[PDB]
Protein backbone atom coordinates (compact mmCIF):
# COMPACT_ATOMS: atom_id res chain seq x y z
CA UNK A 1 0.00 0.00 0.00
CA UNK A 2 2.76 2.12 0.76
CA UNK A 3 4.47 1.99 -2.25
CA UNK A 4 1.67 1.77 -4.34
CA UNK A 5 1.20 5.17 -2.95
CA UNK A 6 4.44 6.73 -3.20
CA UNK A 7 3.66 6.13 -6.86
CA UNK A 8 0.44 7.92 -7.33
CA UNK A 9 2.00 10.55 -5.00
CA UNK A 10 5.06 11.05 -7.62
CA UNK A 11 2.63 11.90 -10.20
CA UNK A 12 0.11 14.31 -7.80
CA UNK A 13 3.65 16.20 -7.39
CA UNK A 14 4.40 16.26 -11.01
CA UNK A 15 1.83 17.78 -11.32
CA UNK A 16 2.25 19.80 -9.03
CA UNK A 17 5.50 21.13 -11.03
CA UNK A 18 3.45 21.39 -14.06
CA UNK A 19 0.82 23.99 -12.85
CA UNK A 20 3.85 26.13 -11.15
CA UNK A 21 5.76 25.69 -14.04
CA UNK A 22 3.06 26.87 -16.47
CA UNK A 23 2.51 30.07 -14.55
CA UNK A 24 5.84 30.96 -14.28
CA UNK A 25 6.07 30.79 -17.91
CA UNK A 26 3.24 33.13 -18.67
CA UNK A 27 4.51 35.44 -15.53
CA UNK A 28 7.84 35.71 -17.89
CA UNK A 29 5.41 37.36 -20.92
CA UNK A 30 3.90 39.47 -17.71
CA UNK A 31 7.39 40.55 -16.65
CA UNK A 32 8.42 41.35 -20.24
CA UNK A 33 5.32 43.78 -21.28
CA UNK A 34 5.67 45.52 -18.13
CA UNK A 35 9.21 46.22 -18.76
CA UNK A 36 8.39 47.60 -22.66
CA UNK A 37 5.71 49.97 -21.03
CA UNK A 38 8.32 51.02 -18.16
CA UNK A 39 10.46 51.72 -21.09
CA UNK A 40 7.71 53.45 -23.35
CA UNK A 41 6.96 55.72 -20.17
CA UNK A 42 10.18 56.89 -20.14
CA UNK A 43 9.77 57.98 -23.19
CA UNK A 44 6.77 59.86 -22.69
CA UNK A 45 8.04 61.74 -19.68
CA UNK A 46 10.90 63.57 -22.07
CA UNK A 47 9.80 67.41 -22.57
CA UNK A 48 10.73 66.74 -25.90
CA UNK A 49 7.41 64.88 -26.73
CA UNK A 50 4.62 67.05 -27.74
CA UNK A 51 0.51 66.32 -26.81
CA UNK A 52 0.31 64.09 -29.86
CA UNK A 53 3.76 61.68 -29.40
CA UNK A 54 2.15 61.34 -25.86
CA UNK B 1 -14.76 -47.34 16.11
CA UNK B 2 -12.02 -44.79 16.94
CA UNK B 3 -10.09 -45.25 13.59
CA UNK B 4 -13.28 -45.35 11.48
CA UNK B 5 -14.35 -42.11 13.38
CA UNK B 6 -11.30 -40.32 13.11
CA UNK B 7 -11.17 -40.92 9.54
CA UNK B 8 -14.89 -39.11 8.95
CA UNK B 9 -12.69 -36.75 11.49
CA UNK B 10 -10.31 -36.25 8.85
CA UNK B 11 -12.58 -35.75 6.48
CA UNK B 12 -14.24 -32.84 8.07
CA UNK B 13 -11.46 -30.79 8.66
CA UNK B 14 -10.47 -31.09 4.89
CA UNK B 15 -13.78 -29.87 4.29
CA UNK B 16 -13.20 -27.45 7.30
CA UNK B 17 -9.83 -25.69 5.38
CA UNK B 18 -11.51 -26.08 1.87
CA UNK B 19 -14.58 -23.28 3.42
CA UNK B 20 -11.56 -21.20 5.05
CA UNK B 21 -9.39 -21.37 1.59
CA UNK B 22 -11.91 -20.42 -0.56
CA UNK B 23 -13.20 -17.43 1.44
CA UNK B 24 -9.36 -16.11 2.16
CA UNK B 25 -9.03 -16.23 -1.70
CA UNK B 26 -12.16 -13.94 -2.09
CA UNK B 27 -11.04 -11.98 0.15
CA UNK B 28 -7.61 -11.54 -1.36
CA UNK B 29 -9.27 -9.69 -4.31
CA UNK B 30 -11.26 -7.50 -1.70
CA UNK B 31 -7.48 -6.21 -0.98
CA UNK B 32 -6.56 -5.46 -4.34
CA UNK B 33 -10.21 -3.73 -5.12
CA UNK B 34 -9.68 -1.59 -1.38
CA UNK B 35 -5.98 -0.78 -2.70
CA UNK B 36 -7.09 0.21 -6.35
CA UNK B 37 -9.47 2.62 -4.45
CA UNK B 38 -6.71 3.94 -2.26
CA UNK B 39 -4.91 4.55 -5.11
CA UNK B 40 -7.90 6.67 -7.18
CA UNK B 41 -8.49 8.54 -3.52
CA UNK B 42 -5.05 9.72 -3.38
CA UNK B 43 -4.87 10.73 -7.36
CA UNK B 44 -8.21 12.75 -6.72
CA UNK B 45 -6.69 14.04 -3.46
CA UNK B 46 -4.27 16.66 -5.75
CA UNK B 47 -6.12 19.64 -6.18
CA UNK B 48 -4.44 20.01 -9.92
CA UNK B 49 -7.78 17.41 -10.57
CA UNK B 50 -10.82 19.22 -11.69
CA UNK B 51 -14.42 18.23 -10.87
CA UNK B 52 -14.31 16.17 -13.92
CA UNK B 53 -11.33 14.53 -12.79
CA UNK B 54 -12.88 13.80 -9.51
Known amino acids: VQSR ?3 VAVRN ?3 GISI ?3 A ?3 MN ?4 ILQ ?4 L ?3 SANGSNSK ?3
Open 52 to 54: SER
Open 36 to 39: RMRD
Open 5 to 7: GLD
Open 24 to 26: EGA
Open 13 to 15: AND
Open 29 to 32: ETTN
Open 20 to 22: AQT
Open 41 to 43: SLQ
